[PDB]
Amino acid sequence: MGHIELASPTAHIWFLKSLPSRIGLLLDMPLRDIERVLYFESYVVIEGGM
């Protein structure tokens, strides 16, 4: 089988989209919050304590 470069990341749109929101489980990302974010639609803070 082949591959592809895939610089644009690809999480399993499988991942965390079923009843087990796996990513919402790991990053604690709220499903609405994570949902708004992945559409590149939030620009949420990532870190930053200062």
């Binding site: 089988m1 082949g2 591959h3 592809i4 470069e5 895939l6």
Partner: protein, 50 residues
């Protein structure tokens, strides 16, 4: 190749026991794939080749 075992080397099966299922990271995606994809054309109609 001696052409007797090279022909013979085609056919063999293992125990394959205890089939497991676990996730995967892209480095092995490069590893398993003999290559990565680059173009969206499949074949020609001008010469009908890969």
């Amino acid at each position: 190749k001696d052409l007797l075992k090279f022909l013979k080397a085609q056919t063999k099966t293992e125990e394959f026991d205890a089939i497991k299922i676990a996730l995967a990271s892209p480095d092995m995606i490069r590893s398993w794939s003999f290559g990565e994809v680059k173009k969206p054309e499949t074949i020609n109609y001008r010469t009908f080749k890969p």
